[PDB]
């Protein structure tokens, strides 16, 4: 209905031209079966000659005279047919592609310009609706679909219907029996495709549920990565992950099995129809003059028409996607929300020293996060006053500044400019009397001259000069090469934040306004710049009424009037003295303040290198593809033999040969093709299956064996890694299938065709290869030309979009209106360049396609041309005329598949790059020894000497600078201080995750780096500051066995008892075997921390590590957990990094750490007796 009605918006010539396009489209479509009627005619005469030459056999010289004269006469008319249709189909070709560019061009240009223009004219609304910059993304995709909707695709659709319905017209008239037979296979072929779609829908959801587990198991483990290494539960998360893989491979293969059978059987019913047509076609020969070979050909083209319906379907999908995308932005495009925004027309008053008078204003933001920021306002400011706003954040100081522009229309009351209504008058004019100095001084990246020039479209370079000088912006322009003509470089790097603000002050001075609205125009600057901007602001004031917003109370001292706010309600009014004397809000504030996915080196067939390593057998698939490839010509030769025994040979046994060939056609084709196709299907099926396992196996097991700048700093999120495993293993699954797919078409065209060529006339071979290789290259060279024009188009539109997106993302473009239409001039000038490229590529796209359809007729041309003459005179044969047409169609399926597997190989290579860099390794925690798991190395005195550290992201302050520590056995090492002191970092280096940039840490003398990995996970008592459960039952969470670990009933009991989680274990029936579910994210914190403790003491370490388990908990929970801790330590090292210094007083050695530097160190009572750092930390904690 409505979807395409809006879509048209077709110009004066366009609406006419839509009809010219339709009009060429029919007659383009029609010409192909008419062209094939001539092919039937050439058959008809050859038969009228052959049946009497063979059935008389009483002359051979009469036949050489009279029979060849009719053939000669017929050939004179043939010459004027193929040339005529060719000359039509050439022109109409160019016309339908001109539809593609020229009509679309003018639509896109209209859309783009309306879009950019409607946006600047609706102000607020664009910002209200969705998020800025996502709009120019979606818009630039939309205008691409426009090319497709006003595209030649529509023309192709009409053309398709003409070959179809129009095919049946000629069919019906030359014989109506066979019409009914073709009309019946259409519902059969449609039923079969219907089972296909069913199989697809069922098997997809199945692969998805299966892979779902493999993604959930892989997701949680790789985020919990530091914890799982540390308890040594790797081999179990590996096995569980392997478990999901065994089930996923069996649904993957059944899918492949079903796909081949559905697809095999599909081709079967096509082959049956192809035979069936002949069999019922023959019945019209032997006993009737009803078919003379006309309908036999004409009905083959009706099948090509039925496939033309299949080509329609994409055309339609392009059109739907084009309308749907369009009508949704049409909504913002056409229809501004308006009547509180606009930008154009209305009355203009005269403002000389406007007042600000606020009358009973309450307002709320759209988001219902902050509702009524403003509520009840009476403020009356006389001209030549300076009003100060002090408050709290939520007073909506920003809100009053928006209402003043008339961006919103206030909920209650009105704000009256010069005591006159602000909702009656033109916005534009209103904007010009009101200067605004922004809280973000972001500007365009254009010349210093252009930035002053945005303030009024009349500033001469003198005034620019005058501007920078009073605005004390006159410094940086001189340092900068080229004075004013210095373009603001990069993304803003030629200017400080301070310098930007200075350009904005200079600009608001150039505008000469009577209201000056200063929003953090003295706040967010350094102590030096502050004075500089203040003096400039002073010089800009005292000739105008102004409102200054500042958080700096030193500048609000000297304001004429201060007005207090505590939430939106105007509380104080008076000047400095009046406020301070009463002790208002103001007096209150005085007192408070006093990619990684683009791998660079490209593969060189590393695909098949790695495939071939994990390859075990299957030489039969490719061999089966070769025979299935030569199997295709057996039909075409058989069809020659059909029409063969009908053209030449008398009436006796014509029928018999056809009956025999019918049966032969069945057994040779339908039956063997299914078998041999399923054999190839079993081969690439199992190939992708075992790749699907082994790859995901070989990545994920290698992942648990890596750490460090991808698990000690991920540069691709967990979900993106899981995505990579998905996509990759699926992609190779299709890749193996593409190998055999190329071999299939290769023997199918080139190979078997050669055999066929040897039985040609030796001239035909020569003539033929002057077509077939040429038309192949010619479609490829079209693809090349297609992408070449596309690539250059994307660059041009990128620049017009870049300058658009920069304006819309800046909310300060809406503040101005003066540079809006200036901006819309530039957008116009930029959009003219694609207009010209659209006209240039109209002839380019136009001439390529015309030349492709010119080679179709030229084939048929050389075919019938040469087929007569020297060949008709002597050595006339029924066959090799139909094989030429097959050869044309063999190049079609070769070029088509070759182009198809171009993106297949691309994505296959990319998948390979990933699998190679995983195989490339980072060889940290691969497994090492320096002991035999000796039990006389237990604890030690662990040394840290001269250790510096800074994260793999370098800008984040180096947290360890000059750190050296010591820890003696049997003693709790507290570590206290404050954040960013490398508290946590110390625990990380003792666990062996990302060891320090410089310096070293030793056990007894052997580095952590060379420490025995296995024994290290039976030497840790780690506790997270976020403990997280696994999908495993609580019993299995609590304890995890391995070949480094044991588990037992008695163990989990003692762990739960000691950890005090046993309270919670009691509740819930099945006790320990009770599963919570939902990744056990349903537990309360107290429960969680205990669960981490129970894990800790299972490992039987002599080192406990505690990560903020009293700053992630509160109350009785902290205490109970400290009790679990107290009974665990029976005289062993513990690390408490916790920031509650009130529960640290038991620690034997407290280290006060500043930025890697031990400041004070010692036992509690010493440090506490000091009035130094430590005591100050305990004082301030409480
Ligand atoms: N237009 C806005 N809508 C929503 N939040 C805003 C907006 N502008 C600023 N903010 C943020 O919300 C905070 C408080 O809201 P606001 O009503 O602007 O209080 P105030 O202007 O008095 O500081 C600001 O400090 C800022 O971080
Ligand atoms: N793997 C990491 N990569 C990047 N930054 C990290 C990583 N780990 C932690 N950080 C960040 O570095 C901060 C400071 O580190 P650290 O001094 O160890 O913290 P704290 O002393 O408060 O426990 C962390 O609080 C966090 O914001």
Short mmCIF file of C-alpha atoms and ligand atoms in Angstrom, two decimals, residues 365 369-370 373 392-399 402 551, ligand 1:
data_model
loop_
_atom_site.label_atom_id
_atom_site.label_comp_id
_atom_site.label_asym_id
_atom_site.label_seq_id
_atom_site.Cartn_x
_atom_site.Cartn_y
_atom_site.Cartn_z
CA UNK A 365 13.83 17.58 31.33
CA UNK A 369 15.92 10.81 35.58
CA UNK A 370 15.74 14.52 36.78
CA UNK A 373 15.09 20.84 38.16
CA UNK A 392 23.89 23.05 43.80
CA UNK A 393 23.96 20.67 40.83
CA UNK A 394 20.12 19.93 40.03
CA UNK A 395 19.04 23.55 40.21
CA UNK A 396 18.91 23.66 36.51
CA UNK A 397 21.11 26.68 35.95
CA UNK A 398 21.53 25.25 32.42
CA UNK A 399 17.82 24.94 32.04
CA UNK A 402 17.92 27.09 27.24
CA UNK A 551 31.31 28.14 40.62
N1 LIG B 1 20.59 19.31 29.53
C1 LIG B 1 20.93 18.46 30.49
N2 LIG B 1 20.15 17.37 30.76
C2 LIG B 1 20.54 16.48 31.68
N3 LIG B 1 21.61 16.56 32.52
C3 LIG B 1 22.35 17.68 32.30
C4 LIG B 1 22.11 18.59 31.32
N4 LIG B 1 23.03 19.57 31.27
C5 LIG B 1 23.88 19.27 32.22
N5 LIG B 1 23.57 18.08 32.85
C6 LIG B 1 24.25 17.31 33.90
O1 LIG B 1 23.36 17.21 35.05
C7 LIG B 1 23.89 17.89 36.21
C8 LIG B 1 22.79 18.53 37.01
O2 LIG B 1 21.68 18.95 36.28
P1 LIG B 1 21.32 20.57 36.12
O3 LIG B 1 19.83 20.65 36.23
O4 LIG B 1 22.02 21.07 34.89
O5 LIG B 1 22.00 21.38 37.43
P2 LIG B 1 23.01 22.79 37.51
O6 LIG B 1 22.82 23.44 36.09
O7 LIG B 1 22.41 23.59 38.59
O8 LIG B 1 24.39 22.41 37.77
C9 LIG B 1 24.96 18.87 35.67
O9 LIG B 1 25.99 19.22 36.55
C10 LIG B 1 25.49 18.00 34.46
O10 LIG B 1 26.52 17.02 34.83
#
